[PDB]
Subunit: 404 residues, 3 copies
Amino acid sequence: SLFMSCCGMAVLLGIAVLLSSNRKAINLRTVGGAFAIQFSLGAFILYVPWGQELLRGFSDAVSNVINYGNDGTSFLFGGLVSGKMFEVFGGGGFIFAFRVLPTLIFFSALISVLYYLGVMQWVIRILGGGLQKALGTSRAESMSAAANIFVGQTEAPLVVRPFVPKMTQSELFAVMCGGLASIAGGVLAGYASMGVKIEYLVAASFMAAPGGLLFAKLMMPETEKPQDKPANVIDAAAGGASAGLQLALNVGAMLIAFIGLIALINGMLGGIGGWFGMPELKLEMLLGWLFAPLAFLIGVPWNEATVAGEFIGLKTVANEFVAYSQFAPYLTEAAPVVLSEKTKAIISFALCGFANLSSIAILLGGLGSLAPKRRGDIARMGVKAVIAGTLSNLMAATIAGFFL
Amino acid sequence: SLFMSCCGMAVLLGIAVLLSSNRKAINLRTVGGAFAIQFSLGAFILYVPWGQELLRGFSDAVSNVINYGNDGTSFLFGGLVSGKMFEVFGGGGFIFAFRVLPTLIFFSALISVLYYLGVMQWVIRILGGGLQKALGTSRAESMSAAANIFVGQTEAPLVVRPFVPKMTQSELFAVMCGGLASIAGGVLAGYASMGVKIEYLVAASFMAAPGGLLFAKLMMPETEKPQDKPANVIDAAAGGASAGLQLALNVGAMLIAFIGLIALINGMLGGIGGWFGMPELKLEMLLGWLFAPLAFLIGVPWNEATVAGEFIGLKTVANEFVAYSQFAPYLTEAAPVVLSEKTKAIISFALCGFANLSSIAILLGGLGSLAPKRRGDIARMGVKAVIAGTLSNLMAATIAGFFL
Amino acid sequence: SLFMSCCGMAVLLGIAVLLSSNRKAINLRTVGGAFAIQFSLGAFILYVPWGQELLRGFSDAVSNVINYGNDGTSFLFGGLVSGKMFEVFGGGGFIFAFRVLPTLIFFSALISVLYYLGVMQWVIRILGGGLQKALGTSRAESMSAAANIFVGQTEAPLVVRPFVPKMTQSELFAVMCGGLASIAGGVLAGYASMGVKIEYLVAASFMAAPGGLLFAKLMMPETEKPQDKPANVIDAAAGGASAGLQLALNVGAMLIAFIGLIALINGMLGGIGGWFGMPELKLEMLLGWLFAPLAFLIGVPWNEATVAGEFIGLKTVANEFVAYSQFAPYLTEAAPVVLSEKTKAIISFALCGFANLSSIAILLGGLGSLAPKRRGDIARMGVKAVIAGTLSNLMAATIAGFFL
Ligand SMILES: CCCCCCCCCCO[C@@H]1O[C@H](CO)[C@@H](O[C@H]2O[C@H](CO)[C@@H](O)[C@H](O)[C@H]2O)[C@H](O)[C@H]1O
Ligand SMILES: CCCCCCCCCCO[C@@H]1O[C@H](CO)[C@@H](O[C@H]2O[C@H](CO)[C@@H](O)[C@H](O)[C@H]2O)[C@H](O)[C@H]1O
Ligand SMILES: CCCCCCCCCCO[C@@H]1O[C@H](CO)[C@@H](O[C@H]2O[C@H](CO)[C@@H](O)[C@H](O)[C@H]2O)[C@H](O)[C@H]1O
Ligand SMILES: Cc1cc2cn([C@@H]3O[C@H](CO)[C@@H](O)[C@H]3O)c(=O)nc2[nH]1
Ligand SMILES: Cc1cc2cn([C@@H]3O[C@H](CO)[C@@H](O)[C@H]3O)c(=O)nc2[nH]1
Ligand SMILES: Cc1cc2cn([C@@H]3O[C@H](CO)[C@@H](O)[C@H]3O)c(=O)nc2[nH]1
Ligand code: NA
Ligand code: NA
Ligand code: NA
């Protein structure tokens, strides 16, 4: 029952300790409090009545912003995003390119505006400040952790960019983990537009901040000593829109290519598998069979672990966007396999993160531009940081499944 | 009657003089002739029979080029831009992304071709030469003024780029005003494709050249002493297409974001306004209520000034493309408020310009790349240049409403 | 009969010799074997039973990869690329922007993956090695020739980039000719998706390698003495997708502009032609009338030479993508003029190449970045290289028509 979840949390903590750079340097206050905050934050908004109301209140607000932003894409694509599309194409009336991708543009513009006004910096300063005073983590790495709740892995360190070239290896590693453990506000609304429950996305986003620090300080404890704009609001919106556009195009091209490549792989796997009496062999089977124990460990029922392993595995070997794309049909009435509500929650939390191998190259570019003489350290800690970010997503999923 | 229009012209001239850097340095020949040309050009093509025939003749030619260019977008998007779209989606069958945006690509390619052949330089040399011999303005600032009739604010100074780093503050300010007072050939066909009368767009484009110089020399008189390629036509077209593409993507992303942001603002304004007994409070109401006296001053009837203020205000606080998008439904039979034909003309002329605050950042990049040591002067004169460009659009609207 | 084809081959060889930089320096082994290989390769896969089976076997494999890749674009555009589009828009249900362009993204990602795994380098090393041992051509120019069978003119020299800045003028010219005579794997599937027979595209791609070297060494014999990576496979796919995206956007913008410009030209040509009693005068008539002898020379029947000249001419004065776009309707049942199966083959082979004037500027950028001090030589040999690449396509067409 609930005992399998507590065992799951222990295993996840255990792996991090085994992969630590110095187990004797692990600050018990830091990693103890970081786990405590993530666990309590989960208990607050998923179990406690008042916390559930604040979560649904924030989520409904987010859901309202999405609809407002949809006026923009509705103007540009007209009837191609109207209700008439379902009367004609049925299920195929939902055009992903026009329904989901433009959201990345609107939310990038919005966040850019919220930065210009000082609203973003205000919230980050409060959250990031509360983390460092409770965990003993440094100022810069804590602000980046809090920033990662709302923005992406390359945008979050910008709030502390003059402190990045000289921050310690542990600090830099945590900054990397802050981004890998979390997502961004832009794609959050994208996944939400695909059918993923906003409550789960918002929750996993907030739990990423203490979770990211937790496994960063477990696997890479501090062994050193740390230290310590657009002309107007309309320009801010324009710059944000431009950034979101480029990003919308990149995601769209990636999805066309990756899904296409997966279709090619399955074709080959059918022929190769046929040589061993398994012509039905696909990539989903391999990933599901290999990640089933991992899915079972985080609280997924035995009879649903294999299907859950398909999505979690695909998120790891590729990215979370491709995973969500294959998981979204399981959230509709036309789902091939009806999953339990708890299993739907666990997958949503376990997928909610940028933790993948390809994110290392992205970290090298974005974070590396802030500190060009530190690209060596980033590439060195890349794989470990992905593992740490992965463990944070898995932990958040285990916690979510515990109180559900 | 016609007395309210002449008062409007006087007020617009008055504001420019009050905001001048030196009223005693204002050359009466320059500003007298510049206003005379703009006023006579208006009288010519909007009142005089022969001038109206030349205007409708040029406009029909422009309208033919658009249809020719539409063969390109029809090939690429097929039935999504056919008549069948209206039989299925009705009004929503008009997909803006495929109907309007591709025009920016075709016209950018065309203008690039017309530059390679020397056709553009020929027309500019004639118009720009006639301006300097009549106004006493310098060679470079006059050519840029004439160039701005056909191309954008960043492309126009390219015909005089080696003279830009060393031109006087008054010259540079005029070059800035030449672009802010005008639009570009690419978007002209875009606005035309949205329902805006081509005759008004062509007229306002030509009246921008003397109008831009007029308020540039009023607000910033000359107190100093002025001075004085693709391998083939197919490469020219390719480069122009590429530029138009990037530009089409930028405009599309901006519209999705800005319209989305406006929808968010209205949602908030409804809640905030509700605290003061005005739950129906929107951005259009604020802009309309605040720009109604300005609209009434340029010749809009009292009972139509508020609606006209919504579009003029939106053009100023954002850009003219967003304004035209909200004004285009008022040019159809399904218009929420039936406006007089004169009011439709005034709004079309008052909106026809790149005069907005966001254009300053664009001027800093484009025009600043031609003279990097002059970016300081550009940012300093930015706001004044926007005002000057705004006054030129308003003046052109007042004149247009006078002869109508 | 077959005598007209052999005369065609002789004329094509004759022109190259007349335009040679040194006829006395022409290596008879090189140009004799190069023609022999291209002729035998044609005889192998178009006439010989076993060769026809290997061709249809490879083509069916390519056709399977395309369908697999189409799962990506089907996910993104949903019902807009489904069969329902034909029930509603009929022929206009085929949306080029969503049917053809995304293929460029998937195949760029795939090729990028096949490079990371070492599969591409393996095949190139075998083919490129066989060429140099049989023709006596240098190592680097032979590998680039073999690489050009699968990738584009700017990507092919990358397999020998450290040898490019110091290769001889003849070597550099051959590298240029290798790209102009061939296409790329990405657009191959694009043209295939437009109705062009894959068998012809694959054949012309392979015949481009010896054909490119043939006319390179004829027109520019060697008079000097020659000499002699992404972190993971998922990053490779991502980078390839990104490159294909940018390329898909460029092609799309080019087609909108060029087709639009052609529509404008025809409008003007109708008015100009009307002055000489030819109001029906169009660009297709001019190109067809001017390229008819050339089409007749390569094996096109007298009563089909004019129509064939329209496409071949358009490919030369613009690019092969615009040509294929106007030729694709002639491959359907709704063709305005029913052409013989041999004529359809000849046009497909004669169009299958990047040989156009605009490709010189592309060569200056791509190939020039590998050797910035050699951009002078590239621009100097540009036109000659286009002619050489043109002759290779024409030769491949003559050969194809011979065995058909
Ligand atoms: C969707 C519509 C919603 C309604 C929104 C309307 C809000 C209007 C924005 C105006 O804000 C100002 O704009 C200036 C223009 O950029 C800025 O000046 C800046 O730039 C000037 C010149 O470029 C300089 O003179 C100034 O020093 C510098 O502050 C200035 O800071 C900024 O406060
Ligand atoms: C839609 C179809 C409509 C039909 C249009 C057909 C028109 C054909 C264009 C040819 O124009 C020439 O092309 C050359 C190729 O770039 C240029 O050479 C330029 O570049 C060469 C090499 O790159 C150099 O040798 C030359 O010196 C240099 O003039 C040359 O200037 C230019 O006049
Ligand atoms: C669509 C799904 C199909 C399933 C595909 C799954 C395949 C998984 C790819 C893993 O490959 C490895 O990834 C590492 C991560 O980049 C590379 O490390 C590289 O980068 C590391 C850190 O960034 C360094 O530590 C290493 O030295 C360096 O080899 C490494 O070379 C590469 O072999
Ligand atoms: C708004 C935003 C979306 C985004 C996506 N990514 C990367 O793209 C993948 C797909 O979502 C992620 O795994 C990341 O590796 C990123 O690095 N920053 C982002 N900001
Ligand atoms: C063809 C062309 C369209 C264009 C638009 N713009 C800017 O974008 C806004 C929207 O139209 C304008 O207000 C300008 O600030 C520009 O600077 N140059 C342009 N050329
Ligand atoms: C995959 C790929 C398509 C491509 C097209 N082009 C150029 O674009 C034109 C249209 O196809 C060609 O004539 C070439 O001049 C290129 O240079 N490289 C390419 N790679
Ligand atoms: Na983040
Ligand atoms: Na202009
Ligand atoms: Na090639």
